[PDB]
């Protein structure tokens, strides 16, 4: 019903930002860990180069 | 097939400071992602709260 | 006639798929710090 | 030994190479999580 249904939407659009909230951290936390992952190839291939 | 001590010390000396990096990045690489590990299960769970709504 | 419920089993499927992907990558990452720990003692 | 240090030095480039094939493969998972990420959210946009 009418107010039913409006309950859950401002349910989830609370719960969809904490979604947005979260992936930006995890989006952000993955490059970081793209980069360090880079950076651990790079002294493989040191060690490769000497 | 001709390096002597010393050139083989060096080598042992190059070779160990670079197995330092790999654990340093060893231990960078394995907090970042339980990090991440930790931030995918609250953004799966949300979606769990999403679904039972 | 709001069916949202086309949404709830959207979301599920995307919940499933996106751990199991999780939960695949998160091995396969195991798998490579191992790798990373038998180079590191070596 | 030189030999010694040659040895420890192509068991490395062994193990190397099984960190880039297996980083070659989280990199094609992360991906596939990556769009299925993206494509739920594609789901939580539609409120319209």
Redesign the interface.
């Known amino acids: 019903t009418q107010q039913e249904?409006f309950d859950?939407q401002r349910?989830?659009?609370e719960?969809?930002e904490?979604?947005?909230t979260?992936?930006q951290?995890?989006s952000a936390?993955?490059k970081?860990?793209?980069e360090?992952?880079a950076?651990?190839?790079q002294?493989?291939?040191?060690?490769?180069s000497?």
């Open positions: 249904i859950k349910r989830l659009q719960l969809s904490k979604v947005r979260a992936h951290e995890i936390l993955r970081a860990l793209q360090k992952e950076e651990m190839l002294v493989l291939e040191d060690i490769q000497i």
